[PDB]
């Protein structure tokens, strides 16, 4: 048939390392092309490299292609991963007249190396109001995994990598808030595994 298959729905890898993304396809076409795209979180689509079915392994910048024509596998390799490389990557197959067939993509999360972790949960009051507060988990290691809230009246976002460029300081953070009565920051992330030395301010 006409199918392109990207087995890895999601992959995590540390910064500056290399990653290999597999792409298999079945096709009755014997002259064709392979495209690789990078979709940013903004959903902006970006062309990276194209591999011709009659050419040797394409290479450009930090990207490299491993074309194994017999197995119909055309893996793209990214070296020296940067935080900007965290995105969803797509493998695409095209013919000799503009037609194309897309796989369903692969989400890459590049984990940064936190050199001085300091996990803490802080409470922040509204600039304008009262009662309306938010709890902030931040400065934890990228191997710590924040857990989806299991209480539908408490909202908790996934991890978030910010980059204070002026200080060469990267830190993770997550936000939790709720309208319920006696919602407290100490209770917000009980559904997640937080470090045992997680700072909870006493005053």
């Amino acid at each position: 048939a006409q199918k392109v298959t990207q087995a890895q729905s999601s992959v995590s890898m540390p910064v500056r390392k290399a990653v290999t993304l597999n792409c298999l396809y079945e096709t009755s076409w014997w002259s064709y092309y392979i495209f690789w795209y990078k979709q940013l979180p903004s959903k902006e689509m970006i062309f990276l490299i194209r591999q011709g079915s009659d050419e040797q392994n394409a290479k450009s910048g930090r990207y490299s292609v491993n074309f194994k024509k017999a197995a119909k596998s055309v893996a793209l390799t990214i070296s020296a991963l940067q935080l900007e490389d965290s995105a969803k990557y797509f493998c695409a197959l095209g013919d000799t007249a503009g037609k194309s067939t897309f796989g369903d993509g692969t989400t890459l999360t590049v984990k940064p190396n936190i050199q001085n972790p300091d996990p803490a949960v802080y409470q922040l009051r509204d600039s304008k109001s009262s009662d309306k507060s938010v709890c902030l988990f931040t400065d934890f290691d990228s191997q710590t995994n924040v857990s989806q809230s299991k209480d539908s009246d408490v909202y908790i976002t996934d991890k978030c990598v910010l980059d204070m460029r002026s200080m060469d300081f990267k830190s993770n953070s997550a936000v939790a808030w709720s309208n319920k009565s006696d919602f407290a920051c100490a209770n917000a992330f009980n559904n997640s595994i937080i470090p045992e030395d997680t700072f909870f301010p006493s005053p």
Binding site: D118, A120, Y122, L124, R125, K128, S133, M164, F199, P201
Partner: peptide
């Protein structure tokens, strides 16, 4: 939309200040 000011504890503990927008 609302803006939430940083906590004095983060300022004390890390010498940084995180603002949150909702």
């Amino acid at each position: 939309v609302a803006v939430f000011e940083p906590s004095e504890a983060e300022i004390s503990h890390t010498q940084k200040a995180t603002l949150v927008c909702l």
